[PDB]
Tab-separated table of all heavy atoms in Angstrom:
chain	number	residue	atom	x	y	z
A	1	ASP	N	0.780	-1.179	0.041
A	1	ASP	CA	-0.022	-0.016	-0.001
A	1	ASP	C	0.837	1.261	-0.012
A	1	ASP	O	0.320	2.311	-0.328
A	1	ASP	CB	-1.041	-0.022	1.127
A	1	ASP	CG	-2.426	-0.308	0.557
A	1	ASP	OD1	-2.568	-0.687	-0.594
A	1	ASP	OD2	-3.412	-0.131	1.318
A	2	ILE	N	2.048	1.204	0.456
A	2	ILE	CA	3.028	2.314	0.401
A	2	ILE	C	3.342	2.611	-1.042
A	2	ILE	O	3.319	3.813	-1.496
A	2	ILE	CB	4.326	1.970	1.165
A	2	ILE	CG1	4.120	2.079	2.675
A	2	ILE	CG2	5.463	2.879	0.705
A	2	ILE	CD1	3.479	3.382	3.042
A	3	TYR	N	3.623	1.566	-1.819
A	3	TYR	CA	4.114	1.732	-3.167
A	3	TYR	C	2.995	2.092	-4.207
A	3	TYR	O	3.311	2.567	-5.292
A	3	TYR	CB	4.836	0.449	-3.576
A	3	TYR	CG	6.049	0.199	-2.647
A	3	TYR	CD1	6.039	-0.870	-1.764
A	3	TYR	CD2	7.155	1.035	-2.713
A	3	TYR	CE1	7.118	-1.122	-0.905
A	3	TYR	CE2	8.251	0.830	-1.838
A	3	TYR	CZ	8.246	-0.232	-0.997
A	3	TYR	OH	9.332	-0.398	-0.181
A	4	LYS	N	1.714	1.889	-3.871
A	4	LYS	CA	0.625	2.234	-4.743
A	4	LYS	C	0.033	3.622	-4.590
A	4	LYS	O	-0.988	3.939	-5.146
A	4	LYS	CB	-0.546	1.220	-4.544
A	4	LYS	CG	-0.095	-0.216	-4.688
A	4	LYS	CD	-1.253	-1.158	-4.628
A	4	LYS	CE	-1.335	-1.820	-3.253
A	4	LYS	NZ	-2.480	-2.771	-3.185
A	5	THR	N	0.771	4.492	-3.844
A	5	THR	CA	0.437	5.919	-3.858
A	5	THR	C	1.740	6.687	-3.697
A	5	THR	O	2.691	6.228	-3.029
A	5	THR	CB	-0.582	6.369	-2.768
A	5	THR	OG1	-0.165	5.905	-1.471
A	5	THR	CG2	-1.979	5.979	-3.065
A	6	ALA	N	1.758	7.877	-4.300
A	6	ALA	CA	2.913	8.772	-4.269
A	6	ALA	C	2.397	10.237	-4.193
A	6	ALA	O	1.265	10.527	-4.484
A	6	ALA	CB	3.745	8.567	-5.516
A	7	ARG	N	3.280	11.127	-3.786
A	7	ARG	CA	3.032	12.560	-3.896
A	7	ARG	C	4.094	13.154	-4.795
A	7	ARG	O	5.313	13.006	-4.592
A	7	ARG	CB	3.018	13.243	-2.540
A	7	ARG	CG	3.168	14.748	-2.570
A	7	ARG	CD	2.843	15.262	-1.219
A	7	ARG	NE	1.522	14.699	-0.818
A	7	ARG	CZ	0.854	15.021	0.230
A	7	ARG	NH1	1.345	15.899	1.067
A	7	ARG	NH2	-0.292	14.466	0.524
A	8	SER	N	3.664	13.954	-5.778
A	8	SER	CA	4.580	14.519	-6.753
A	8	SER	C	4.428	16.012	-6.771
A	8	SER	O	3.664	16.595	-5.995
A	8	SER	CB	4.325	13.877	-8.142
A	8	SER	OG	3.107	14.275	-8.658
A	9	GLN	N	5.213	16.640	-7.649
A	9	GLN	CA	5.091	18.089	-7.739
A	9	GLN	C	3.919	18.481	-8.673
A	9	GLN	O	3.121	19.376	-8.263
A	9	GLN	CB	6.356	18.668	-8.324
A	9	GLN	CG	7.438	18.831	-7.252
A	9	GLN	CD	8.640	19.443	-7.789
A	9	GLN	OE1	9.392	18.797	-8.513
A	9	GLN	NE2	8.816	20.726	-7.486
A	10	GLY	N	3.808	17.812	-9.813
A	10	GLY	CA	2.749	18.192	-10.691
A	10	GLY	C	3.046	18.196	-12.147
A	10	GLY	O	4.112	17.880	-12.585
A	11	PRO	N	2.081	18.623	-12.929
A	11	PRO	CA	2.225	18.582	-14.384
A	11	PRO	C	2.792	19.834	-15.022
A	11	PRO	O	3.066	19.728	-16.167
A	11	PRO	CB	0.817	18.381	-14.872
A	11	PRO	CG	-0.047	18.345	-13.674
A	11	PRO	CD	0.700	18.998	-12.601
A	12	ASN	N	3.051	20.861	-14.288
A	12	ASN	CA	3.625	22.021	-14.909
A	12	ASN	C	5.114	22.038	-14.622
A	12	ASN	O	5.502	22.554	-13.664
A	12	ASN	CB	3.029	23.267	-14.384
A	12	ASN	CG	3.453	24.504	-15.103
A	12	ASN	OD1	4.055	24.393	-16.102
A	12	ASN	ND2	3.117	25.585	-14.603
A	13	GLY	N	5.895	21.623	-15.608
A	13	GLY	CA	7.295	21.517	-15.516
A	13	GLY	C	8.081	22.807	-15.305
A	13	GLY	O	9.088	22.755	-14.697
A	14	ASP	N	7.666	23.867	-15.947
A	14	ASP	CA	8.260	25.209	-15.838
A	14	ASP	C	8.180	25.621	-14.429
A	14	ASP	O	9.179	26.106	-13.897
A	14	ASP	CB	7.457	26.174	-16.725
A	14	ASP	CG	7.805	27.667	-16.500
A	14	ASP	OD1	8.963	28.004	-16.227
A	14	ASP	OD2	6.904	28.496	-16.644
A	15	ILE	N	7.037	25.470	-13.828
A	15	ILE	CA	6.847	25.780	-12.408
A	15	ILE	C	7.542	24.850	-11.464
A	15	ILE	O	7.997	25.263	-10.423
A	15	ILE	CB	5.367	26.080	-12.071
A	15	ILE	CG1	5.247	27.347	-11.251
A	15	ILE	CG2	4.798	24.986	-11.256
A	15	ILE	CD1	5.084	28.630	-12.042
A	16	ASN	N	7.629	23.571	-11.827
A	16	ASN	CA	8.284	22.546	-10.991
A	16	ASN	C	9.699	22.827	-10.780
A	16	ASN	O	10.198	22.679	-9.730
A	16	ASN	CB	8.187	21.183	-11.588
A	16	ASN	CG	6.876	20.542	-11.455
A	16	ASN	OD1	5.998	21.089	-10.842
A	16	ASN	ND2	6.686	19.417	-12.069
A	17	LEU	N	10.390	23.245	-11.850
A	17	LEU	CA	11.834	23.566	-11.867
A	17	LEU	C	12.246	24.679	-10.929
A	17	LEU	O	13.336	24.662	-10.470
A	17	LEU	CB	12.275	23.844	-13.278
A	17	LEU	CG	12.446	22.707	-14.214
A	17	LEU	CD1	12.653	23.205	-15.599
A	17	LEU	CD2	13.543	21.734	-13.868
A	18	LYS	N	11.368	25.575	-10.727
A	18	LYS	CA	11.529	26.741	-9.917
A	18	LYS	C	11.151	26.512	-8.431
A	18	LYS	O	11.095	27.343	-7.663
A	18	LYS	CB	10.670	27.860	-10.476
A	18	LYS	CG	11.296	28.697	-11.554
A	18	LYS	CD	10.537	29.955	-11.698
A	18	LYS	CE	11.463	31.162	-11.858
A	18	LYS	NZ	10.900	32.477	-11.314
A	19	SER	N	10.826	25.246	-8.096
A	19	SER	CA	10.457	24.910	-6.764
A	19	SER	C	11.051	23.634	-6.267
A	19	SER	O	11.530	22.865	-6.997
A	19	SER	CB	8.927	24.691	-6.642
A	19	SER	OG	8.206	25.727	-7.333
A	20	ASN	N	10.988	23.453	-4.965
A	20	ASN	CA	11.379	22.223	-4.309
A	20	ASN	C	10.145	21.701	-3.632
A	20	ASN	O	9.263	22.513	-3.180
A	20	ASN	CB	12.482	22.484	-3.254
A	20	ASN	CG	13.900	22.294	-3.795
A	20	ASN	OD1	14.225	21.291	-4.405
A	20	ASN	ND2	14.789	23.248	-3.502
A	21	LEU	N	9.938	20.414	-3.514
A	21	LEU	CA	8.848	19.807	-2.791
A	21	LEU	C	9.497	19.569	-1.470
A	21	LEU	O	10.438	18.816	-1.410
A	21	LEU	CB	8.498	18.506	-3.447
A	21	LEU	CG	7.222	17.845	-2.933
A	21	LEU	CD1	6.063	18.776	-3.187
A	21	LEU	CD2	7.117	16.579	-3.713
A	22	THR	N	8.944	20.072	-0.397
A	22	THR	CA	9.717	20.118	0.875
A	22	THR	C	8.965	19.516	2.046
A	22	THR	O	7.886	20.005	2.407
A	22	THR	CB	10.106	21.586	1.180
A	22	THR	OG1	10.756	22.137	0.070
A	22	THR	CG2	11.118	21.608	2.343
A	23	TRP	N	9.533	18.505	2.666
A	23	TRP	CA	9.149	17.984	3.938
A	23	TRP	C	10.164	18.386	5.012
A	23	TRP	O	11.361	18.451	4.733
A	23	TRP	CB	9.106	16.459	3.870
A	23	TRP	CG	8.111	15.778	2.951
A	23	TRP	CD1	6.833	15.334	3.288
A	23	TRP	CD2	8.280	15.502	1.549
A	23	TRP	NE1	6.257	14.722	2.165
A	23	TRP	CE2	7.077	14.847	1.093
A	23	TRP	CE3	9.301	15.736	0.606
A	23	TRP	CZ2	6.941	14.422	-0.220
A	23	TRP	CZ3	9.127	15.325	-0.668
A	23	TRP	CH2	7.987	14.703	-1.087
A	24	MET	N	9.718	18.710	6.222
A	24	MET	CA	10.697	19.017	7.266
A	24	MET	C	10.219	18.478	8.644
A	24	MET	O	9.027	18.382	8.875
A	24	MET	CB	11.011	20.476	7.317
A	24	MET	CG	10.294	21.323	8.312
A	24	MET	SD	11.318	22.704	8.647
A	24	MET	CE	11.500	23.423	7.045
A	25	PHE	N	11.197	18.049	9.479
A	25	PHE	CA	10.853	17.229	10.625
A	25	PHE	C	11.619	17.692	11.862
A	25	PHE	O	12.811	18.044	11.777
A	25	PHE	CB	11.115	15.720	10.396
A	25	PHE	CG	10.535	15.195	9.132
A	25	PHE	CD1	11.189	15.362	7.893
A	25	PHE	CD2	9.364	14.513	9.163
A	25	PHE	CE1	10.651	14.858	6.735
A	25	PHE	CE2	8.836	13.976	7.998
A	25	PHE	CZ	9.470	14.163	6.806
């Protein structure tokens, strides 16, 4: 069940490049 879902940045590549997907703990 871990492997059958993911979180991604998205479909807009231009915007994705200009950002980081960030978790912090």
